């Protein structure tokens with residue numbers, strides 16, 4: 001049934017998957033492209049190495065498997081197959097996920113000088129995917145260019161389900177976060193977060209697609225806050241006064257900034273302006289950016305409002321088939337506490353349930 005091929009690590013896969021070649025790298029290792037001789041299509045192949053090795057990674061892997069299966073939305077990456085080459089629960093080591101194959105992540109698209117039609121279409125698809133997650137009870141919290149993928153026909157999919165809400169303990173730990181440029185400021189302000197944490201990330205991604213550089217590029221929390229207030233301005237006295245004392249004192253002690261008007265921050269001449277239509281769309285794009293890149297989450301636009309925005313809603317087709325809300329058969333998907341051996345069996349059964 002199987003054959004082993006070495007990319008930078010060895011991949012042991014079903015014979016139907018041929019010509020494996022690395023297309024990217026992440027926390028779970030190498031992702032390969034492959035040709036599925038049985039389907040006749042190209043696919044992506046991801047290997048999860050001993051995902052049950054610890055409680056943190058086990059819970060994350062189990063959640064991803066359950067959600068990838070249950071969710072079926074055109075802007076969330078599709079799971080096509082799941083398998084393990086090992087023959088018993090005891091010998092079980094590795095899980096292989098087979099996904100639909102896309103052409104690039106959004107990091108590549110930032111340099112591609114997109115026009116209003118392509119930019120708004122990508123943003124519409126992103127917001128559709130986020131809306132579907134939110135309707136399923138999932139706030140993503142870690143959207144960024146590298147976990148959003150696109151095809152050359154401008155179709156777009158969100159690659160993963162983000163970060164579950166979890167209390168960090170000595171044994172449920174937090175992977176270190178490398179890329180922090182897209183995370184809303186209420187987190188580092190100690191405020192906690194709501195669903196429109198994801199809207200801030202979309203605002204940051206949209207800004208980068210338009211400008212070609214990272215909007216808020218800080219080296220740590222202190223630097224990140226400075227880069228936010230230098231561009232958007234010091235938030236209101238009432239907002240600052242509602243912060244916890246140490247944070248409040250710090251942010252009230254910073255130099256004050258008026259904020260750069262969005263007409264100066266995102267000026268007409270970095271957008272298309274050939275036609276009268278282009279000039280209307282530029283105003284609309286800037287209006288949407290000014291409603292997403294808002295420090296105070298109580299004043300930031302919602303996903304539902306963003307989808308209705310004139311820049312975005314041109315792409316809504318009432319004749320298109322809607323996606324049904326997922327039916328997540330495991331209700332206690334976040335309330336799970338298990339020893340390693342129990343996680344291993346839970347994950348194994350999920351994998352076998354596919355065969």
Ligand SMILES: Nc1ncnc2c1ncn2[C@@H]1O[C@H](COP(=O)(O)O)[C@@H](O)[C@H]1O
Pocket residue numbers: 023024025026027028031044077099100101102103104105146147149159
């Ligand atoms: N299904 C896929 N299609 C295309 N590229 C992918 C796919 N999955 C992952 N990638 C690429 O691999 C990188 C790392 O993936 P990941 O660590 O799983 O988020 C991404 O930023 C993409 O460039």
